[PDB]
Design a protein around this ligand. Structure first.
Ligand code: ZN
Ligand code: ZN
Lengths: 331, 134, 293, 222, 114
């Protein structure tokens, strides 16, 4: 978190633009200096941990970033004044870590500072009290999992936790359920067992072929090979066909974006606006790891087809449904 | 055979400068386009986007004789540059850099925009199927 | 005062918006006895709300073979929803999967973009960190090479896990963090890569500086995570199975270092645990979180 | 002769071109092309059962690369161009695609070292500082405050209160340009203080909001 | 059971017919390319769905480190006496403890059921 993630969080963040003249701020390399506590007079000084516990004092190492400020004022002259090592705040430090003060001191030394060599470390003395952070288990991400809901009309449903790699916290959960032999058959038009996909930032569920077309790949053949790779199986054609004819003429990519845009937010303002947000939402919110770049959504298409294909595998019984307790499906 | 014993040796040159930035055109082979049928062509950047980024619009054999849309590939020199190798009268080879990759897809004849009303008509047909019951 | 606030109050999130913030974390370390201190430090917390009517997660799943200590479970509203790690597990710290991708470039990987959609069906699809990164026609070779690589500490760290499943032909190489990993010994045919000379180098560690790093970098130990554990065949002891008779099997790939390292830091203070009833041993780990000293 | 007019000559000539994929490090070597741009010599050997195309770097460019032939089927590739004179031309159709690979030699040993040299700029790192850098200085007048002072002095706030009839004639010229005029625009026009300007504006006409705010000023009908 | 894609407009074709010759046809609704239906047969639903796994088993299962290696049944096709024997590992699990075995001899893959 100190050695690498912190530099990555400051280094990679939106540039500060504020403008007539405009002002630009760029962050550089974070420096973190050993824990130091400055007394009433203020001589900054070292804080061997024993003192911190006794004087009810938090253990924190000063964090200093470097920011360079360049201003363009329509004079076309650039003055990137550099401020270096500017206080941003203080980060808590685990004891016995590469960045603590007890790191690698031979036993005679720890004993001189009134610390115990046998003691494990790995705790934060916050407010003069040691705090241990319990590792908290999480559901695994990046994997198409198929879990079957007993009560709902969805015979099977597949989900992908969406994570983008040391970049952004929001994670999405595209679901690609099938409406086959579930709950009450009701109507749902003549078509039945239709693959349907909830998506991030939408209103009503979207038929799958449409999403694929909207990403593009309008040709119904293209959509089919992107999902079912081999056309030899007889059972496969029957399974992928009811949904294949959800409807059509949604073939213009823009038309499709509009249908999903109308299938989104609230009573649509205008097609042009509806197309704009829906167009950008699919590029970033959906499948961020597969296609972080807005361009070349080709990678996104292969993964979207994969989730549909894995749901089909569960239906035909080729691959057994997944488990929610396996410790590999947990991070 | 001549080609079965075709041993040769030439000289390659990538001129640092070119008076014709070379790119890549990309039609489909499943289409098997007869280039001989192309008496003429027009080639302009696509107007939907209302320059170097603009998709191409190719009009062959008149405005509606033949028309294709070319869409730029994501990358072309992201890891490896692409070169055009051409044979010269001196036998030596000349290499030309590929600036860009454009994908030319055969355009649907009908074109136009179906609009919300066409989508609503599909929804109305779905509603009629929903209406049927006992 | 964001990190201090969260690291003292234990609320994870902004102080103002307490709408989406969980708690029950960053609790004070228990210092009553040294054994309790170690157990408190090495603990996971499955995060399900406690009272979902069903008890699916609490039941020990079979995939906790050395991932978690089976005996150590708290008694109360937190039953089987607070587990402690076994002595030898080692959670992955996290790496960048870019180097491994460049290796497969010189090892016959076809980037998906170049590949025709048609050929995908016959061969196997490498997936990395969950993003499809291509297709390779002859799978075993990539694998056999890939393991050799992790084993000699070049491109891929020991932490990367190369899982390959024959039926679906997806070799997923996961190099992210938070994956429970168990060091396990590696055996070729029916022979131990670990050999006598190595133990001799380890015995005089003080002068020859032959560290555990050296044992791994010699390729006689590998960290087999749960995903890798799905494809492998392990032997409880070398004498028990790496010997020939009407073998239950002859393909054992990996054999375990000592089976009594599947128990944590507070069920290793108990002698003869198997002889005693299992609930009695759980009750005693709870009593140990009580004994002074 | 038109900008959107595409030359079809190459195509209609059935002109053929070759397409070759080249690694960047080689391509970086090629940006340093020897002489005019000559980068070396190609070597094509064809036999009854095999065909070998290879490239060797120029002695100068240096200070065996086997080719892998690739299929061009599935996509009819051609080469269009944009001249320095912006004229457009189709040179040919691609009759061959190929990839330059090592001679079954470079694995991840020489590669990793070229890659180690290739890394050049590692993604930055959090360095360890010694002691603590100075944070608070002793400035007397803040620099930003000193800059406004010279401007505040230069034009002493606003002005005085005189020559209202002379100001009225200037306001009337502005009123001709727009019947309703923003008060803030009038404030920019007159150096005199806003309160004095408002009194003259009230005399000429009642302020009208106009439903757009800004209390636009218009000439009285009387 | 199959599909027809419009040769040109590229769209799934549909079973249509003309009273004029009372003839089965397959037509896309996207445009008008249409062809008489050659199969003369349309939607099929099978409830029994009794499917032999011999078809499904991939031949690569032979190398699984874990699967067993009996020497009891030699390959009929090639005679290597070693094989890997696995159960269905699929649904339709009302009556299935059959033991599909597979030729392990490298490069054979005879999928002999029993
Ligand atoms: Zn048609
Ligand atoms: Zn055989």
């Amino acid at each position: 978190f100190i050695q690498m993630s912190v530099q990555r969080i400051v280094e990679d963040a939106p540039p500060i633009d504020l403008q007539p003249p405009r002002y630009l701020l760029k962050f550089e390399q974070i420096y973190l200096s050993k824990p130091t506590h400055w007394e009433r007079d203020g001589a900054p000084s070292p804080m061997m941990p024993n003192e911190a516990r006794l004087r009810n004092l938090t253990y924190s190492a000063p964090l200093y970033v470097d920011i360079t400020k360049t201003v363009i004022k329509e004079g076309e002259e650039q003055l990137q004044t550099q401020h270096q090592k500017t206080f941003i705040g203080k980060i808590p430090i685990m004891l016995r870590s590469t960045y603590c003060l007890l790191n690698g001191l031979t036993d005679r030394d720890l004993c001189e500072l009134n610390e115990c060599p046998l003691d494990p470390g790995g705790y934060f003395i916050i407010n003069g009290s040691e705090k241990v952070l319990i590792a908290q288990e999480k559901m695994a991400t990046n994997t198409v999992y198929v879990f079957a809901k007993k009560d709902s009309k969805y015979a099977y449903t597949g989900e992908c936790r969406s994570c983008l790699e040391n970049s952004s916290r929001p994670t999405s959960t595209i679901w690609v359920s099938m409406l086959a032999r579930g709950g009450q058959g009701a109507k749902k038009s003549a078509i039945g067992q239709r693959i349907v996909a909830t998506l991030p930032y939408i209103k009503q569920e979207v038929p799958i072929i449409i999403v694929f077309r909207a990403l593009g790949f309008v040709s119904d053949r293209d959509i089919l090979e992107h999902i079912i790779y081999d056309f030899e199986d007889p059972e496969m054609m029957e399974m992928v066909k009811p949904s294949l004819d959800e409807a059509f003429v949604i073939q213009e990519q823009n038309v499709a974006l509009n249908f999903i845009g109308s299938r989104g937010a609230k009573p649509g303002v205008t097609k042009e606006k509806r197309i704009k947000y829906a167009k950008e939402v699919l590029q970033k919110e959906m499948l961020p790891h597969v296609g972080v770049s807005d361009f070349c959504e080709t990678k996104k298409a292969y993964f979207l087809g994969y989730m549909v294909h894995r749901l089909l595998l569960a239906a035909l019984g080729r691959r057994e449904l997944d488990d929610r307790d396996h410790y590999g499906n947990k991070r | 055979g001549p080609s079965s014993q075709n041993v040769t040796e030439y000289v390659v040159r990538v001129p640092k400068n070119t008076t014709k930035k070379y790119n890549i055109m990309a039609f489909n082979a499943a289409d098997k386009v007869n280039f001989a049928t192309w008496n003429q062509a027009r080639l302009e950047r696509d107007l939907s986007n209302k320059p170097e980024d603009q998709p191409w619009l190719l009009r062959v054999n008149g405005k509606s004789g033949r028309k294709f849309k070319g869409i730029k590939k994501g990358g072309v020199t992201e890891n490896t540059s692409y070169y055009i190798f051409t044979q010269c009268p001196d036998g030596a080879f000349e290499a030309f850099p590929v600036h860009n990759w454009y994908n030319f897809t055969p355009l649907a004849r009908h074109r136009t925009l179906t609009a919300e009303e066409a989508e609503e008509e599909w929804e109305r047909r779905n509603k009629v199927l929903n209406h049927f019951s006992i | 005062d964001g990190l201090k606030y969260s690291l003292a109050t234990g609320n994870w999130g902004d102080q103002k918006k307490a709408h989406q913030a969980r708690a029950g974390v960053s609790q004070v370390l228990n210092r009553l006895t040294f054994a309790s201190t170690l157990s408190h430090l090495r603990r996971l917390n499955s995060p399900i709300g406690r009272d979902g009517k069903l008890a699916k997660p609490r039941q020990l799943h079979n995939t906790l073979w050395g991932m978690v200590c089976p005996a150590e479970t708290p008694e109360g509203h937190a039953v089987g929803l607070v587990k402690n790690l076994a002595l030898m597990a080692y959670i992955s710290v996290g790496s960048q999967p870019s180097p491994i991708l460049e290796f497969l470039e010189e090892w016959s990987m076809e980037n998906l973009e170049e590949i025709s959609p048609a050929a995908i069906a016959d061969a196997t699809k490498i997936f990395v960190n969950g993003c499809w990164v291509g297709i390779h026609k002859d799978p075993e070779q990539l694998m056999n090479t890939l393991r050799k690589l992790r084993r000699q500490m070049d491109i891929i760290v020991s932490e990367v896990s190369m899982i390959r499943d024959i039926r679906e032909r997806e070799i997923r190489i996961y190099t992210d963090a938070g994956r429970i990993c168990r060091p396990l010994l590696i055996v070729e045919k029916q022979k131990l890569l670990l050999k006598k000379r190595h133990i001799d180098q380890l015995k005089e560690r003080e002068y020859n500086n032959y560290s555990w790093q050296d044992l791994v970098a010699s390729g006689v130990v590998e960290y087999i995570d749960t995903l890798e554990e799905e494809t492998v065949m392990l032997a409880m002891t070398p004498d028990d199975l790496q010997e020939k008779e009407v073998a239950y099997c002859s393909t054992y790939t990996h054999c375990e270092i000592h089976p009594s390292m599947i128990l944590g830091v507070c069920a290793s203070i108990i002698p003869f645990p198997d002889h005693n009833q299992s609930p009695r041993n759980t009750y005693q780990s709870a009593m140990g979180k009580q004994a002074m000293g | 002769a038109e900008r959107g007019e595409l030359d079809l000559t190459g195509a209609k000539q059935n002109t053929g071109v070759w397409l070759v994929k080249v690694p960047k490090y080689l391509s970086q070597q090629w940006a340093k092309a020897s002489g005019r741009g000559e980068v070396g010599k190609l070597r094509i050997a064809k036999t009854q059962g095999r065909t070998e195309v290879s490239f060797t770097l120029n002695e100068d460019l240096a200070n065996e690369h086997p080719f892998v032939l690739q299929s061009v089927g599935g996509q009819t590739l051609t080469v269009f161009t944009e001249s320095s004179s912006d004229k457009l031309s189709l040179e040919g159709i691609v009759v061959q695609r190929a990839e330059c690979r090592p001679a079954a030699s470079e694995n991840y040993m020489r590669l990793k070292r070229l890659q180690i040299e290739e890394s050049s700029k590692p993604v930055r790192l959090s360095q360890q500082l010694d002691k603590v850098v100075t944070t608070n200085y002793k400035p007397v007048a803040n620099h930003q405050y000193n800059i406004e002072y010279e401007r505040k002095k230069k034009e002493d706030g606003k002005r005085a209160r005189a020559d209202k009839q002379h100001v009225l004639d200037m306001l009337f010229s502005a009123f001709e340009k727009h019947q309703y005029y923003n008060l803030k625009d009038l404030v920019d026009i007159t150096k005199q203080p806003v309160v004095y300007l408002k009194e003259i504006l009230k005399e000429i006409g009642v302020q009208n909001v106009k439903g757009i705010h800004k209390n636009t000023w218009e000439l009285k009908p009387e | 059971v199959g599909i027809r894609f419009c040769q040109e407009c590229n769209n799934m074709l549909y079973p249509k017919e003309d009273k004029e010759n009372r003839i089965l046809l397959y037509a896309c609704r996207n445009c008008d390319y249409q062809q008489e239906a050659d199969n003369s047969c349309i939607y099929v639903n099978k409830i029994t769905h009794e499917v032999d796994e011999l078809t499904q088993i991939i031949a690569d299962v032979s190398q699984d480190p874990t699967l067993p290696r009996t020497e009891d049944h030699p390959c009929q096709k090639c005679g290597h006496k070693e094989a890997v024997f696995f159960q269905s590992h699929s649904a339709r699990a009302e009556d299935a403890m059959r033991l599909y075995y597979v030729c392990t001899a490298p490069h054979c893959g005879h999928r002999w059921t029993e």
